[PDB]
From Swiss-Prot, chain A:
Organism: Homo sapiens (Human)
Protein name: 26S proteasome regulatory subunit 6B
Role noted for this protein: Component of the 26S proteasome, a multiprotein complex involved in the ATP-dependent degradation of ubiquitinated proteins. This complex plays a key role in the maintenance of protein homeostasis by removing misfolded or damaged proteins, which could impair cellular functions, and by removing proteins whose functions are no longer required. Therefore, the proteasome participates in numerous cellular processes, including cell cycle progression, apoptosis, or DNA damage repair.
Assembly information from the UniProt record: Component of the 19S proteasome regulatory particle complex. The 26S proteasome consists of a 20S core particle (CP) and two 19S regulatory subunits (RP). The regulatory particle is made of a lid composed of 9 subunits, a base containing 6 ATPases including PSMC4 and few additional components. Interacts with NR1I3. Interacts with PAAF1. Interacts with TRIM5. Interacts with ZFAND1.
Family as reported in the entry's similarity comment: Belongs to the AAA ATPase family.
Subcellular location: Cytoplasm; Nucleus
Gene designation: PSMC4
Residues of the full protein shown: 71 to 140 of 418
From Swiss-Prot, chain D:
Species of provenance: Homo sapiens
Family indicated by similarity: Belongs to the AAA ATPase family.
Primary role: Component of the 26S proteasome, a multiprotein complex involved in the ATP-dependent degradation of ubiquitinated proteins. This complex plays a key role in the maintenance of protein homeostasis by removing misfolded or damaged proteins, which could impair cellular functions, and by removing proteins whose functions are no longer required. Therefore, the proteasome participates in numerous cellular processes, including cell cycle progression, apoptosis, or DNA damage repair.
Top-level taxon of the source organism: Eukaryota
Result when mutating R9Q: In a colorectal cancer sample; somatic mutation
Residues of the full protein shown: 52 to 102 of 406
This protein's name: 26S proteasome regulatory subunit 8
Curated annotation (Swiss-Prot), chain F:
Keywords, comma-separated and alphabetical: Isopeptide bond, Phosphoprotein, Proteasome, Repeat, Ubl conjugation
UniProt protein name: 26S proteasome non-ATPase regulatory subunit 4
GO molecular function: identical protein binding; molecular adaptor activity; polyubiquitin modification-dependent protein binding; RNA binding
Organism: Homo sapiens (Human)
UniProt GO BP: proteasome-mediated ubiquitin-dependent protein catabolic process
From Swiss-Prot, chain G:
Organism: Homo sapiens
Family: Belongs to the peptidase M67A family. PSMD14 subfamily.
Phosphothreonine PTM sites in chain numbering: T243
Gene name per UniProt: PSMD14
Protein name: 26S proteasome non-ATPase regulatory subunit 14
Residue ranges occupied by any MPN domain in the UniProt entry: 8-143
Amino acids binding Zn(2+): H90, H92, D103
Cystine crosslinks: none
Modified residues (Phosphoserine): S127, S201
Enzyme Commission number(s) of this protein: 3.4.19.-
GO CC annotation terms, alphabetical: cytosol; cytosolic proteasome complex; extracellular region; ficolin-1-rich granule lumen; nucleoplasm; nucleus; proteasome accessory complex; proteasome complex
Highest taxon above the source species: Eukaryota
Length: 70, 77, 286, 51, 225, 190, 287, 77
């Protein structure tokens, strides 16, 4: 059932996401990110995303309205 | 009376605060192979008229399939 | 020819409601409908299906009625909806292939030059994959008959598209699925394969002992076509085969042993980490 | 495990909330006010929280 | 009624239309995910319709997008940048080489650089030598250098472009080299083209050393060309 | 008045003689034309299709409310084969269980243009099975038969019997004449 | 004169066709009419759905010549089940799954024919593999707010079994209409059919892949496991004395030992023991 | 007066006797005020042909006919 809910949280992926660049990590599942719209943010990170994929300011996708790392 | 009601509805929509912008160029879109019924779209292949692309005063360039209440031949980039 | 056919799950789910439509009597109601797909390559896909009426008697296997006008009318209708799909063939809900179906295929072959048929088990009480597919060929024999039309098998499978997969997964919430758990569903696949092999061999034994003991004529083919089955099954008690089999079994057992050895120290690491981080914490807390 | 799956469902709920604009502090002021500056725009004289 | 009725219903039909956003495609992510950049700013990830021939959507192309759903709508040809439009189809007609006289030696030397390699490309290959690219005119004023350019302009009218060489500069740190980008990209799209750069001495000149920050942009326009 | 009038046309070997008109095929064509015009002259809800009586009973036109398409399909029948009456009337009855309107009466009219080679008992049980489900059959003789609708008048009399009297076999006048002479008695009913 | 604890049944083919037609017209709104019946005064069943040719704009979608609809509902009477048009559906891609201003406009027209008219909103964008977002709405009278719309004689359609959303509560929700709770009815003929469309027959179950590719695959996995364990040695032996509360903050980079080991254990064991078991089955079943 | 039958897509036949010289719009407004719907979201179908402006007895119909009422469905934003 946890594997069902792990797939279930992927609703927030959707399709119209903006693109940003990750900057630094603050604590567990919460970090800052720099949107390409211009401004800088402090967002929440989903637990489904592995932490291997972030290091040298990689390109990431953020939500539109909530503006969280997805 | 029937046509004048439509003339009344046109002047309602154009209120007054119109944004101004620039016309970048004029295009023309050819139809495609076969447009599927039940998923067809008017602002697509079934438009053999003219078209234009417009850069707004807010430095955002948009697109419009129907030029609207202007003759296309008068407009120049 | 046509290589293989792919069935989307919108079809073979539209079939079962067609059987629920006028299968109230439920005795010999061979429900027939017309497929809709697109032969984009030698491989084939079907996506839509609709209905045609059909009545026939229990005996008298020559009296039947394929509606021409309904076929043309609803084809024009679905063309007014969907201009991409063209007709490919038909489905009948008979559990086994019948005797008068070749007349139906020869009748409908005017609309499609290679009209495949899909047998769909509406009530698959036998385990296995439903929706087998057949196509018509010429099987000119040396017996003396010039030619006949008795079909042959084409490989089939249920495919998927990126929207119907969502529907069939969400509607599968009344069954537990252990497909995510590995090293278990492979064993169930082995068990299912063993049961299917047993069922097929039981059918072969039933037919062979039926034609063997007086009843039914001895078909001069099959009995020597199945003779080449028994020329196979090589000797398990062969020296070089056993010598190679142990040579590869040990090579697999090396990897299994190293996997156990690489698992045990991770378990020990978790154990001593939990014990140290527990005992120091209770030293602080007390 | 039950805490993990409940946290996942509540995380799906809470991820719809808004973000937070980062900035740097220029200097503190009187009566619990600080002078922050966001990155694209100018400065703001904002208040602090109780925690 | 008369055409006042038919014009009115087309007028009310047209108002229900909406605009579309113009953007460029960076790469293809999956078969249904496409990363695009709106030209005014921020980038997004979008999807196609179903039948837009996704092999044609190459990296670097220009494409339209919807407003609310923000999906891929229709691919478009490359932009023309209407400053370039004002210098392309703007020249009025001129009479031929009869009015210019006394320069028949210099007339034929320009014909062998411009008209001959495109009209007769085989004869240069037969020798096996790449034709020359450009030519420079110079001399005292009032001897007809610009009129000589008008003679070549009204000769075949291939893709003649008239650079004023003083509107190349602008008020920003960019937009000077960026116009030269779109001019030559317009030159690449329409292959037999002619560029005419009158009065180069404004944009051109020599190379300074710690002159002025004003000269740095004029130089930055120069060595880009 | 509303029914699914269903006419059948013979295309046997024996159909290719000219004992009526230039040929029996032509007189059959104006017979079907007069039948369809009488269908159109009724209440405009009735339907007419056709079933042939070849080696395979081919339903050329399924039951349809118009009349022009059946009249166009009447051409090019190519009368080659043997006439069968059991399978033809079975497929004619089974053809009308899928009527679009269920208030339409059950009428099958037949043109027997060759001697129907059939045993009496099979036609008797066919008549009983059809008359159980309130289906009425009229047959029109054409040309030769085994003693000119012998074993057929008992068939239609058992079909409409038990004091029913709903059918009427029309015996053929043994002579070359126009199809109007063959429909004079059934100008309204047989 | 009472709206009770209502319920809507949808069949399997209706939902599958719903999602397919919603996805097939992904950027705009597609249309459709529902086929079903009123089984009782309490519940409404939809057994079939079908689509029509449309004509879409950027913000609106209209119908076409409705002789299609009349002739289609006339012809569907002939084959099998002669139901009625109990409702209509459309799609709202990327939107709030809500009735808009012009969506509620035609709901009055559909309700003027029959009282129990149900609108259905599907969305193929926010829907994911495990769950399809779906909603059914019933138009309520905007003239009667002072009285109760449904008495709620029980606690079926309430905060029970579902909660109202936020974006539905913005564009309407309990205002001008309301929502109804969906359940799925599954007949045994399709019940014992739907659970078996993933398996294969006996050639898939008894098939050794190949031994050369298996040996090369095991060689590759053991080869990368060598360097992965070599990294694991330094990862364990460093273990800087400072509490994982920040050792999970220096792990957020590219660091990967202790995490890829057990995955390689799983892919080695579950691909070796299955192959050895199948080899034994093949070597003593056939003989 | 000819009393015609209208049949909806669902089917609750709203029987209504009409005058024999009601063209298209009088029938539409009568069934609009009976059916409580505004007139512009309406369509009447008879013998696979829409009714636009013609006379009812000139178009066809006798003392009793089964015409089909369909609503023009519409969605959007
Ligand atoms: N060879 C010539 N024959 C006739 N007129 C000429 C000639 N050369 C120049 N002109 C005159 O000079 C004018 C062009 O001057 P301009 O283009 O300024 O020359 P430049 O650009 O070389 O200074 C024309 O109006 C033309 O009348
Ligand atoms: Zn809508």
């Amino acid at each position: 059932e946890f594997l069902h809910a792990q797939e279930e949280v992927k609703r927030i992926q959707s399709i119209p996401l903006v693109i940003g660049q990750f900057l630094e990590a603050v604590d567990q599942n919460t970090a800052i990110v720099g949107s390409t719209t211009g401004s800088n943010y402090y967002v929440r990170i989903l637990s489904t995303i592995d932490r291997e994929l972030l290091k040298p300011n990689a390109s990431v996708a953020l939500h539109k309205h909530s503006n969280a790392l997805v | 009376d029937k046509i004048k009601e439509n003339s009344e509805k046109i002047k309602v929509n154009k209120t007054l605060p119109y944004l101004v912008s620039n016309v970048i160029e004029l295009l023309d879109v050819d139809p495609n192979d076969q447009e599927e019924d039940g998923a067809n779209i008017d602002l697509d292949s079934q438009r053999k008229g003219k078209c234009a692309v417009i850069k707004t005063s807010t430095r955002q360039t948009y697109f419009l399939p129907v030029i609207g209440l202007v003759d296309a031949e008068k407009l120049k980039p | 020819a046509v290589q293989k056919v792919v069935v989307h799950p919108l079809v073979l789910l539209s079939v079962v409601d067609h059987f629920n439509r006028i299968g109230k009597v439920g005795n010999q109601k061979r429900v027939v409908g017309v497929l809709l797909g697109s032969w984009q390559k030698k491989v084939l896909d079907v996506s839509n299906s609709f209905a045609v009426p059909f009545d026939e008697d229990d005996k008298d296997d020559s009296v039947w009625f394929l509606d021409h006008d309904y076929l043309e009318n609803m084809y024009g209708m679905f063309k007014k909806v969907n201009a991409r799909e063209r007709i490919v063939g038909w489905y009948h809900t008979g559990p086994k292939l019948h005797k008068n179906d070749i007349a139906i295929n020869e009748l409908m072959k005017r609309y499609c030059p290679n009209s495949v048929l899909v047998i769909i088990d509406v009530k698959p009480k036998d385990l296995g994959l439903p929706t087998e597919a057949y196509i018509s060929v010429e099987e000119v024999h040396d017996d003396g008959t010039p030619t006949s039309k008795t079909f042959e098998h084409v490989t089939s499978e249920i495919g998927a598209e990126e929207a119907e997969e969502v529907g069939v997964e969400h509607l599968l919430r009344d069954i537990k699925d252990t497909t995510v758990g590995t090293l278990s569903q492979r064993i169930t696949n082995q068990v299912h394969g063993l049961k299917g092999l047993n069922s097929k061999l039981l059918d072969i034994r039933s037919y062979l002992e039926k034609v063997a003991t007086g009843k039914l004529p001895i078909n001069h083919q099959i009995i020597y076509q199945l003779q080449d089955v028994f020329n196979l099954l090589p000797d398990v008690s062969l020296q070089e085969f056993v010598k190679a089999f142990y040579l590869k079994t040990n090579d697999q057992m090396v990897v299994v042993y190293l996997a156990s050895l690489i698992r045990s120290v991770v378990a020990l690491h978790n154990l001593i980490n939990n014990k140290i981080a527990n005992r120091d914490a209770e030293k602080k807390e007390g | 495990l039950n805490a993990k799956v409940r946290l996942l469902r509540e995380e799906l709920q809470l991820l719809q909330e808004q973000g937070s604009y980062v900035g740097e502090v220029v200097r503190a002021m009187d009566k619990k006010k600080v002078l922050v500056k966001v990155h694209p725009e100018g400065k703001f004289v904002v208040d602090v929280d109780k925690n | 009624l008369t055409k006042q009725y038919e014009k009115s219903e087309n007028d009310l039909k047209a108002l229900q239309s909406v605009g579309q956003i113009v953007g460029e495609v960076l790469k293809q992510l999956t078969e249904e995910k496409f990363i695009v950049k709106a030209t005014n700013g921020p980038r997004y990830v979008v999807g196609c319709r179903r039948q837009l021939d996704k092999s044609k959507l190459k990296p670097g192309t220009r494409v339209a997008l919807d407003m609310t759903t923000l999906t891929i709508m229709r691919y478009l040809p490359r932009e023309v940048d209407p400053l370039v439009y004002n210098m392309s189809h703007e020249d009025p007609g001129n009479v031929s080489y009869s009015e210019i006289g006394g320069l028949s030696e210099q007339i034929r030397e320009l014909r062998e650089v411009i008209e001959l390699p495109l009209t007769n490309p085989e004869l240069f290959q037969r020798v096996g030598i790449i034709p020359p690219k450009g030519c420079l005119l110079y001399g005292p004023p009032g001897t007809g250098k610009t009129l000589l350019a008008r003679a070549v302009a009204s000769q075949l009218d291939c893709n003649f472009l008239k650079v004023v060489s003083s509107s190349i500069v602008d008020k920003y740190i960019g937009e000077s080299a960026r116009l030269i980008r779109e001019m030559f990209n317009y030159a690449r799209d329409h292959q037999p083209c002619i560029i005419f750069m009158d009065e180069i001495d404004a944009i051109g000149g020599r190379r300074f050393s710690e002159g002025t920050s004003a000269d740095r942009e004029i130089q930055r326009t120069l060595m880009e060309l | 008045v509303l029914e699914s009038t269903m006419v059948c046309v013979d295309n046997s070997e024996y159909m290719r003689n000219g004992d009526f008109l230039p040929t029996r095929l032509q007189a059959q064509q104006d017979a079907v034309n007069i039948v369809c015009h009488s269908k159109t002259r009724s209440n405009p809800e009735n339907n007419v299709g056709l079933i042939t009586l070849a080696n395979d009973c081919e339903v050329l036109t399924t039951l349809t409310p118009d009349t022009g398409r059946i009249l166009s399909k009447l051409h090019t029948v190519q009368p080659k084969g043997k006439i069968t009456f059991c399978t033809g009337i079975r497929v004619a009855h089974l053809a009308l269980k899928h009527r679009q309107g269920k208030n339409h009466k059950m009428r099958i009219i037949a043109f027997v243009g060759s001697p129907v080679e059939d045993n009496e008992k099979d036609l008797v049980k066919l008549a009983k099975r059809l008359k159980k489900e309130k289906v009425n059959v009229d047959i029109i003789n054409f040309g030769e038969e085994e003693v000119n609708t012998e074993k057929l008048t008992a068939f239609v009399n058992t079909l409409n019997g038990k004091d029913g009297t709903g059918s009427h076999l029309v015996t053929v006048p043994p002579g070359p004449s126009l199809a109007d002479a063959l429909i004079s008695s059934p100008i309204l009913a047989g | 004169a009472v709206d009770t604890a209502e319920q809507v049944y949808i069949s399997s083919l209706a939902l599958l066709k719903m999602l397919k037609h919603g996805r097939a017209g992904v950027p705009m709104e597609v249309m459709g009419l529902m086929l079903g019946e009123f089984v009782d005064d309490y519940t409404v069943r939809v057994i079939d759905v079908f689509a029509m040719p449309q004509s879409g704009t950027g913000v609106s979608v209209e119908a076409v010549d409705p002789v299609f609809q009349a002739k289609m509902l006339d012809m569907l009477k002939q084959t099998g089940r002669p139901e009625m048009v109990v409702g209509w559906y459309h799609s709202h891609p990327g939107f709030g799954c809500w009735l808009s201003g012009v969506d509620i406009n035609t709901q009055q027209s559909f309700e003027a024919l029959s009282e129990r008219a149900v609108a259905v909103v599907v969305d193929p964008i926010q829907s994911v593999k495990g769950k399809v977002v779906i909603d059914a709405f019933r138009l309520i009278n905007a003239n009667m707010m002072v009285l109760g719309h449904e008495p709620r004689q029980t606690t079926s359609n309430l905060g029970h079994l579902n909660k109202p959303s936020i974006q539905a509560l913005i564009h309407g929700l309990n205002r001008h209409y309301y929502s109804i709770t969906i359940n799925y009815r599954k007949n045994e003929l399709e019940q014992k059919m739907l659970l078996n469309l993933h398996k294969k027959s006996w050639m898939e179950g008894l098939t050794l892949q190949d031994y050369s590719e298996h040996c090369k695959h095991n060689e590759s996995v053991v080869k990368e496991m060598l360097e992965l364990a070599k990294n694991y040695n330094k990862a364990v032996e460093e273990e800087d004395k400072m509490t994982p509360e920040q050792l999970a903050i220096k792990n957020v980079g590219k660091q990967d030992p202790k995490r890829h080991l057990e995955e390689h254990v799983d892919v080695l064991m579950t691909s070796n023991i299955v192959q050895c078991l199948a080899a034994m089955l093949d070597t003593v079943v056939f003989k | 007066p000819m009393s015609l039958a209208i049949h909806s897509t669902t089917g609750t036949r709203y029987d209504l006797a009409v005058p024999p010289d009601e063209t298209v719009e009088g029938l539409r407004k009568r069934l609009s005020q009976r059916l409580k719907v505004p007139k512009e979201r309406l369509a009447l179908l008879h013998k696979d042909t829409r009714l636009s402006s013609g006379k009812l007895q000139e178009f066809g119909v006798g003392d009793g006919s089964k015409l089909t009422l369909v609503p023009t469905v519409e969605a959007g934003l």
